[PDB]
Write a protein that binds this ligand. Structure first.
Ligand SMILES: NCCCC/N=C1\N[C@H](CO)[C@@H](O)[C@H](O)[C@@H]1O
Ligand SMILES: [Br-]
Ligand SMILES: [Br-]
Ligand SMILES: [Br-]
Ligand SMILES: [Br-]
Ligand SMILES: [Br-]
Ligand SMILES: [Br-]
Ligand SMILES: [Cl-]
Ligand SMILES: [Cl-]
Ligand SMILES: [Cl-]
Ligand SMILES: [Cl-]
Length: 836
């Protein structure tokens, strides 16, 4: 919003495999792999078994070029700046015969002064990407040991040497595609006098009465004269000015530091999803020289406090978030990259993923450390959806080097991304890495390395995670929490450690523990736990053949990367369900299983507030069509788990929990207000619809804000017979004084495999128009865990993976832009259908 002119360098690019002298059109931002695919120079890397057939790319070097025109009038501007938001990774940048940059960190943006190198007329930009494998082979050869990075799918674990997305080398839900390229935008800015290098809105204090801010600017003045200027900051809300402040300065050549206080009286606070509005102010900083605004930069700013409380207490050491002074139970998931090829993730895909977290009642996301520091749009969407962000630095599972050069590269990326992200309302904390200290302690090592190399790794840990990173946070983001590792102390095999900080409870899945264990094995905060599923059939059809459907088949094992995969799924399924004979039915029941088991954990964590203060499941999403722990597949289809997470995260939840042949019912609220004069009503209904016994009523209930409380206990014995338990379910509703329903739940008394489910038809009527299909479903008898299956990729449902209750009609709306007036194919599956 100033006199500068920005040229986007996003057209006219060509690329070439080094040594071929053969050039073709490219798409920038982009990746080498996509550029090849677009010219049918590579097969669909996600299809079938194309993974092995695409690996060759990682051994070549790749060159990119573009030309552009500069006019005499542009060449005459005071300054001209070329900005690379992202280069993956070892890139030699040449412009007009000048080596401008030898890039070496995927996570750093580079700002380059180029006016003295540009020419009137045609200009030639030329980028040389060294193979990150061949670049680091000599480095590895000199190292004399292989770092234990099991997720790096190569004999030589080269990932640890490069500041490049860890997942790109492979992971336990991911394809190996060690790509290269101009992965974020390239801009040329022509400007006068100065640019704003950094604008930081630093909150000094916040009360209901006043927010005090400090506007900290860094201005890079490019001309040799002293330049009188006036710095102005405008604070607005919804287009209307709230306050305005200004400061006279004379800008000196080079860097200038400018600080302007501003205050907002009676500030409208940013609140997280579920507690109100994610209000964002617009803060705009301008540099005005005479009549002209030579430089402007704005941020959207949310006014709130976030405190992470991590303190010794009677239970061990707490780990929770206090938002605007109120302890906030965290509800969310771990986020991984949305694609093997990052530039392929569109604005639309980011918007939809946030819609998916918001609609599932989430208030937090963990950006896990084997991915990337996300793009600005991700954090912008987190801001406007009221989702808190836990940001790992990009270190995961393995110890890393700690030599001076390496720590210099890391320092660059830490400074860059902290300054990049620190104005976001959503940003809640930093975490040095995923599971490295656990790895060092327990994985085990010290049987794997000499004592000397082991000691070096231990000192190397401290240098990076207990010194460099926490110092950098203290300097550049001094009011945000940092912890050196997640989990920082708790280990899932060591019950004595569970009351200390956050847990990754991998007892379920890796430890083979039943889902019931989640009721007893409680953390102070669950930062990971999870369970895998095959994605639904239309997703399998994007990647496998009917031949290719047994699963531990070649491909159906090729698409599983956990240490066991599809073995474990069957093992757990047998505990609770009849294992279906057909592959398609097995896929359906596996979705149901992951949903039901995980939901039982999310409920245990909320039920056990305040001992437990959060649950973030592993994992939200997928990077490609694969078998994984995700609740949303690569094509955006919600698995059962996503619907179940939405239910389990509902602001008010009725939670029936049955153990030791007894039922308790808890009422769980994350509301900010207390509910008074409430009635819990329950009744036992058989699978034919017939009420058994009488309604049970619990009157005069209070549901206080932000609490979980037991309101009802009954022994099963004397109430229902073992036969009644396999033949009926419990219906529960909660209502206010007048009889308006605020919540409902259903409860089963036995495992699904033990239920005497009746054969039944789910019939439906359909009303189909452009973009929309409204179905009304009916079954005279219980239909268990119904799946409404359509072939349309990414179709959205008002509900799915729910029990259709006997004789009770249920409306479901299906939407997709592909739905054309004039029949959407619909296949309704339910549990009884899967066996005979
Ligand atoms: N020793 C095996 C236990 C690893 C637990 N951690 C994770 N599990 C996920 C699924 O396996 C994995 O993708 C992530 O790195 C995560 O931190
Ligand atoms: Br310049
Ligand atoms: Br510059
Ligand atoms: Br200064
Ligand atoms: Br919330
Ligand atoms: Br620390
Ligand atoms: Br029981
Ligand atoms: Cl502590
Ligand atoms: Cl060794
Ligand atoms: Cl239960
Ligand atoms: Cl069950």
């Amino acid at each position: 919003n100033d006199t500068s002119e920005v040229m986007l360098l996003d057209t006219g690019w060509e690329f070439s495999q080094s040594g071929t002298e053969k050039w073709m059109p490219a798409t920038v931002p982009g990746t080498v792999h996509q550029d090849l695919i677009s010219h049918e120079l590579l097969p669909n890397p996600f299809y079938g078994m194309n993974e092995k057939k695409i690996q060759w790319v990682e051994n070549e070097d790749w060159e990119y070029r573009t030309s552009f025109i500069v006019s005499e009038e542009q060449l005459n501007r005071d300054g001209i700046q070329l900005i690379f938001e992202g280069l993956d990774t070892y890139a030699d940048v040449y412009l007009n015969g000048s080596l401008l940059l030898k890039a070496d960190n995927m996570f750093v943006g580079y700002t380059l002064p180029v006016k003295s190198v540009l020419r009137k007329g045609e200009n030639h930009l030329y980028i040389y990407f060294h193979s990150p494998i061949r670049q680091t082979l000599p480095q590895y050869a000199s190292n004399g040991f292989n770092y234990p990075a099991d997720n790096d799918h190569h004999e030589k674990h080269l990932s640890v040497f490069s500041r490049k997305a860890p997942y790109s080398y492979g992971w336990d839900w991911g394809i190996r595609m060690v790509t290269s390229g101009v992965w974020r935008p390239v801009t040329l800015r022509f400007y006068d006098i100065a640019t704003i290098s950094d604008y930081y809105v630093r909150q000094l204090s916040l009360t209901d009465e006043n927010a005090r801010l400090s506007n900290e600017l860094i201005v890079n003045q490019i001309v040799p004269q002293k330049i009188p200027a006036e710095v102005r900051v405008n604070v607005s809300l919804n287009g209307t000015t709230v306050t305005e402040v200004k400061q006279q300065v004379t800008l000196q050549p080079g860097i200038n530091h400018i600080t302007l206080p501003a205050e907002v009286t009676n500030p409208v606070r940013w609140m997280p999803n579920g507690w109100g509005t994610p209000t964002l102010y617009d803060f705009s900083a301008q540099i005005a020289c005479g009549d002209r605004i030579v430089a402007e930069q704005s941020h959207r700013i949310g006014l709130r406090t976030i405190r992470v409380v991590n303190e010794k207490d009677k239970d061990g050491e707490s780990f929770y978030f206090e938002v605007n002074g109120i302890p906030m139970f965290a509800k969310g998931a771990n986020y991984i990259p949305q694609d093997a090829l990052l530039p392929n993730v569109t604005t639309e895909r980011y918007q939809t993923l946030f819609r998916d977290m918001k609609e599932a009642n989430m208030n937090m996301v963990r950006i896990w450390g084997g991915g990337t520091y996300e793009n600005n749009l991700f954090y912008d969407l987190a801001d406007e959806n009221g989702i808190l962000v836990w940001q790992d630095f990009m270190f995961a599972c393995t110890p890393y080097p700690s030599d001076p050069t390496f720590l210099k590269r890391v320092e660059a990326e830490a400074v860059y991304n902290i300054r990049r992200l620190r104005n976001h309302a959503s940003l809640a904390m930093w975490c040095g890495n995923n599971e490295i200290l656990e790895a060092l302690k327990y994985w085990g090592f010290e049987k794997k390395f000499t004592p000397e190399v082991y000691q070096g790794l231990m000192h190397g840990y401290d240098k990076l995670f207990r010194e460099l990173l926490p110092s950098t946070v203290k300097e550049f983001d001094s009011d945000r929490f940092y912890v050196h590792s997640s989990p920082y102390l708790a280990n899932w095999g060591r019950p004595e450690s569970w009351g200390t900080g956050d847990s990754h409870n991998w007892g379920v899945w890796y430890g083979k523990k039943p889902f019931e264990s989640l009721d007893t094995d409680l953390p102070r905060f669950m930062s990971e736990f999870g369970f895998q599923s095959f994605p639904e059939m239309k997703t399998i059809a994007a990647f496998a053949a009917p031949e290719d459907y047994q699963i531990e088949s070649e491909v159906m094992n090729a698409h599983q990367k956990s240490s066991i995969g599809n073995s474990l799924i069957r093992t757990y399924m047998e505990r609770d369900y009849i294992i279906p004979e057909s592959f398609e039915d097995f896929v359906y029941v596996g979705l149901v299983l992951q949903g039901q088991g995980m939901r039982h954990g999310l409920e245990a964590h909320r039920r056990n507030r305040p001992y437990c203060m959060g649950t973030l499941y592993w994992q939200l999403n997928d990077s490609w069509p694969v078998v994984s722990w995700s609740s949303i597949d690569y094509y955006g289809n919600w698995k059962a788990l996503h619907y179940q997470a939405k239910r389990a995260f509902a602001p008010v939840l009725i939670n029936p929990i049955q153990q030791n042949d007894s039922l308790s019912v808890y009422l769980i609220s994350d509301r900010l207000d207390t509910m008074e004069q409430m009635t819990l009503e329950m009744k036992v209904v058989d699978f034919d619809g017939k009420t058994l016994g009488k309604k049970i009523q619990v009157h005069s209930l209070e549901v206080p804000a932000n609490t979980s409380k037991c309101v009802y206990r009954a022994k099963l014995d004397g109430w229902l017979t073992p036969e009644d338990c396999r033949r009926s379910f419990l219906k529960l509703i909660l209502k206010d004084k007048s009889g308006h329903q605020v919540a409902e739940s259903v409860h089963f008394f036995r495992k699904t495999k033990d239920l005497q489910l009746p054969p039944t038809s789910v019939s439906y009527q359909m009303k189909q128009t452009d973009g929309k299909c409204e179905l009304t479903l009916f079954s005279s008898m219980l239909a268990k865990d119904i799946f409404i299956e359509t072939p349309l990729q990414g179709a959205r449902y008002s509900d799915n993976f729910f029990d259709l209750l006997p004789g009770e009609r249920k409306k479901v709306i299906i939407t997709s832009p592909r739905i054309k007036k004039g029949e959407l194919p619909v296949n309704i599956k339910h549990i009884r259908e899967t066996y005979k």
